[PDB]
Amino acid sequence: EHALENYWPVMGVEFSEDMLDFPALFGREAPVTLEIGFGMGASLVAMAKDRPEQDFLGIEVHSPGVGACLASAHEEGLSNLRVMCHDAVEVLHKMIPDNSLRMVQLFFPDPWHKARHNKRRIVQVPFAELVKSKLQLGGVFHMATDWEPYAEHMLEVMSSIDGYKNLSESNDYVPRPASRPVTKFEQRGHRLGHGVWDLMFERVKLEH
Numbered sequence: 001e002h003a004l005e006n007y008w009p010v011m012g013v014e015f016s017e018d019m020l021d022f023p024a025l026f027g028r029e030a031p032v033t034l035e036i037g038f039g040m041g042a043s044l045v046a047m048a049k050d051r052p053e054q055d056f057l058g059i060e061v062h063s064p065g066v067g068a069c070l071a072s073a074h075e076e077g078l079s080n081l082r083v084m085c086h087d088a089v090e091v092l093h094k095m096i097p098d099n100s101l102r103m104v105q106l107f108f109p110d111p112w113h114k115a116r117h118n119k120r121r122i123v124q125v126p127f128a129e130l131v132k133s134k135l136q137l138g139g140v141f142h143m144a145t146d147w148e149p150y151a152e153h154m155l156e157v158m159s160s161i162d163g164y165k166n167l168s169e170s171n172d173y174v175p176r177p178a179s180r181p182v183t184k185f186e187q188r189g190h191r192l193g194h195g196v197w198d199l200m201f202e203r204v205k206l207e208h
Contacts, residue, residue, distance in 0.1 A: 041069025112146035151197035
């Protein structure tokens with residue numbers, strides 16, 4: 001169909017040198033959740049559909065994914081979803097106000113299997129710090145991966161940052177929350193583990 005063309009003018013948000021005003025954007029004062037790299041937006045649409053009392057922003061640079069998400073959001077009659085097609089880090093720096101977000105989601109970011117590409121992995125200290133600055137206190141950074149070396153790297157990064165508190169009761173990974181759906185990479189309750197690792201850290205006041 002012609003989803004980008006049809007639905008971008010209503011739900012799309014253009015990149016700007018200026019901070020977003022969430023009340024003006026969403027027409028109300030409500031909690032805001034950002035999904036970074038939403039793919040086809042299946043998780044984001046399901047999330048927004050279940051929480052009409054909350055607002056949702058998505059970022060995805062893969063424009064066919066953006067189109068798929070718009071088509072689905074339109075079909076579900078969502079009024080509480082906006083999407084961007086711009087580098088997420090630039091959007092975080094330029095357009096997301098500090099302390100503004102209830103939740104940030106990062107599901108299956110490029111795992112960059114090869115050791116020579118390890119630095120291409122988006123979860124690193126400066127990125128996670130930037131995300132933390134955009135969370136309100138008590139807000140959560142939730143990431144997921146189906147690649148264990150990435151999961152271990154994510155845990156190392158997150159554990160090193162003052163102001164992030166691990167919500168894992170075993171100091172590593174958390175049960176999949178309702179806020180993320182089961183995927184095809186996933187064998188829930190499998191004897192060798194689910195095959196997907198969830199990490200959730202709450203923003204707390206700095207200790208040191």
